[PDB]
Amino acid sequence: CTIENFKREFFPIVYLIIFFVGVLGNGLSIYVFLQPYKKSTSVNVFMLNLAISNLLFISTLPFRADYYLRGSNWIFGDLACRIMSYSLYVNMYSSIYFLTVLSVVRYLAMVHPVTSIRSAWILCGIIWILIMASSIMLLDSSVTSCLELNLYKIAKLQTMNYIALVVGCLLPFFTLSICYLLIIRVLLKVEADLEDNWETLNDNLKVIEKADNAAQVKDALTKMRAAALDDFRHGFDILVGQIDDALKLANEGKVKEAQAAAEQLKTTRNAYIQKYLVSHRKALTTIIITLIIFFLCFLPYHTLRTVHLTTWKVGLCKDRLHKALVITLALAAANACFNPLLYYFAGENFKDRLKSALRK
Ligand SMILES: O=C(O)CCCN1C[C@@H](C(=O)O)Oc2c(NC(=O)c3ccc(OCCCCc4cc(F)ccc4Cl)cc3)cccc21
Numbered sequence: 285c286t287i288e289n290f291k292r293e294f295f296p297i298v299y300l301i302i303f304f305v306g307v308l309g310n311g312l313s314i315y316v317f318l319q320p321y322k323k324s325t326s327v328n329v330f331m332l333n334l335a336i337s338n339l340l341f342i343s344t345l346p347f348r349a350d351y352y353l354r355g356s357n358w359i360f361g362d363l364a365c366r367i368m369s370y371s372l373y374v375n376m377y378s379s380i381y382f383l384t385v386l387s388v389v390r391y392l393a394m395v396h397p398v399t400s401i402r403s404a405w406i407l408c409g410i411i412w413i414l415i416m417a418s419s420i421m422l423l424d425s426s427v428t429s430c431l432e433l434n435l436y437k438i439a440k441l442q443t444m445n446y447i448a449l450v451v452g453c454l455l456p457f458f459t460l461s462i463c464y465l466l467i468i469r470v471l472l473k474v475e476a477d478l479e480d481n482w483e484t485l486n487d488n489l490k491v492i493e494k495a496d497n498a499a500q501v502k503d504a505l506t507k508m509r510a511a512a513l514d515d516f517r518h519g520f521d522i523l524v525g526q527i528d529d530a531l532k533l534a535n536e537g538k539v540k541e542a543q544a545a546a547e548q549l550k551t552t553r554n555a556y557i558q559k560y561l562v563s564h565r566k567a568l569t570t571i572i573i574t575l576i577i578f579f580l581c582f583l584p585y586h587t588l589r590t591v592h593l594t595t596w597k598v599g600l601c602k603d604r605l606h607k608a609l610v611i612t613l614a615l616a617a618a619n620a621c622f623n624p625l626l627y628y629f630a631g632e633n634f635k636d637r638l639k640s641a642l643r644k
């Protein structure tokens with residue numbers, strides 16, 4: 285079949301690229317995750333678990349590459365061949381679940397009604413164990429054609445596919461869709477409220493900026509304090525305190541100095557606004573990247589995988605569908621080197637921590 289020549293030319297290249305990009309990205313990421321960072325949240329745990337899984341899977345891609353460079357011949361043993369499948373599917377579904385967990389955690393962080401480090405490790409251990417246990421029949425106590433689909437494997441894999449498709453791909457993707465919905469909702473409502481607070485404060489600052497006497501400045505500062513009342517919370521409302529100082533000046537009759545005080549109070553409020561809007565932005569970013577990962581890496585692969593299993597026959601080549609499966613399989617594997625784009629653009633000050641970790 286034509287697809288066999290295609291795979292022999294295609295997989296060595298893509299796998300070894302994924303290996304090179306993935307060892308670099310994950311080793312660097314893991315190094316950053318293991319270095320001490322004071323304000324490190326449970327996010328750090330989930331990313332780290334993902335990174336480690338991704339790296340363990342990447343350590344197998346040379347062997348796969350080897351298989352195809354030899355003309356689809358597995359020279360390693362039966363056990364290494366079983367480990368190929370075991371690593372591939374454990375890493376796949378572990379990754380999907382850590383990513384789902386990371387989006388959920390990041391949503392909870394914006395809403396905050398926390399995941400501690402120890403709890404994050406327990407949740408990770410449970411994910412590891414459930415998925416390793418679900419996968420052990422890939423390790424059953426032919427092999428020359430290690431990575432192929434054959435007629436003895438097809439009956440088991442049809443049943444295995446049903447369950448892995450539903451529970452390991454569609455259920456987490458559904459969870460991600462709900463997460464996106466919830467994050468958009470929270471972000472829009474919170475940003476509407478932040479606009480209203482900013483605008484009330486700016487109204488009163490404009491009033492104070494052109495006020496006739498000290499009583500008027502005092503009244504508008506009082507209204508400002510009423511607006512300031514109602515996750516760092518601006519160092520326990522630092523702006524609200526500075527306003528109290530300005531109100532003292534007002535009650536002393538110092539109009540010019542109270543106006544001067546009010547006019548630098550414009551910026552300390554948007555400091556608060558941003559300290560609590562950056563978490564909402566982190567969650568939006570996490571969910572958008574993760575959904576792109578699903579649409580690129582996992583959903584086409586599970587679709588075509590299912591159709592391939594369903595329509596498979598030992599005599600027929602099925603070249604277009606099989607080639608589409610091969611390319612989507614490559615994208616499922618490439619996820620292991622994609623995941624640091626998440627770490628970098630949606631980690632916890634990851635660019636800062638990288639700069640600090642590499643500087644001599
Ligand atoms: O190269 C090529 O020509 C193309 C690929 C050939 N090829 C090679 C073959 C191969 O591997 O050798 O695989 C296929 C499959 N495999 C599956 O359809 C499957 C379905 C399920 C499955 O489950 C593993 C354990 C999952 C445990 C789990 C985790 C969860 F998170 C939730 C539930 C569960 Cl149960 C493994 C494979 C389907 C179609 C083709 C092949």
Ligand SMILES: CC(C)CCC[C@@H](C)[C@H]1CC[C@H]2[C@@H]3CC=C4C[C@@H](O)CC[C@]4(C)[C@H]3CC[C@]12C
Pocket residue numbers: 461464465468469
């Ligand atoms: C991944 C895919 C399926 C995402 C689904 C897209 C649609 C169905 C989602 C994405 C954003 C969602 C909206 C987000 C915000 C709100 C405000 C809320 O007070 C009413 C529901 C409403 C209007 C949601 C409706 C459903 C919604 C439009």
Ligand SMILES: CCCCCCCC/C=C\CCCCCCCC(=O)OC[C@H](O)CO
Pocket residue numbers: 314317318319329332336339340343401
């Ligand atoms: C040939 C086979 C190749 C295999 C390649 C080896 C893969 C393992 C690499 C790094 C492990 C990192 C160990 C991570 C330990 C995490 C626990 C921890 O130390 O805590 C983390 C953080 O500091 C507080 O939560």
Ligand SMILES: CCCCCCCC/C=C\CCCCCCCC(=O)O
Pocket residue numbers: 298301302305611614615618621
């Ligand atoms: C930056 C590292 C990323 C590595 C990504 C590897 C995944 C490759 C996925 C898609 C590439 C598609 C190439 C298709 C070539 C078709 C050739 C042909 O039709 O004969």
Ligand SMILES: CCCCCCCC/C=C\CCCCCCCC(=O)O
Pocket residue numbers: 310311312314315318319320
């Ligand atoms: C140590 C792993 C050996 C296998 C090679 C894999 C690539 C290296 C990946 C991560 C190396 C991290 C180095 C150890 C950091 C210890 C934590 C610390 O520095 O405090």
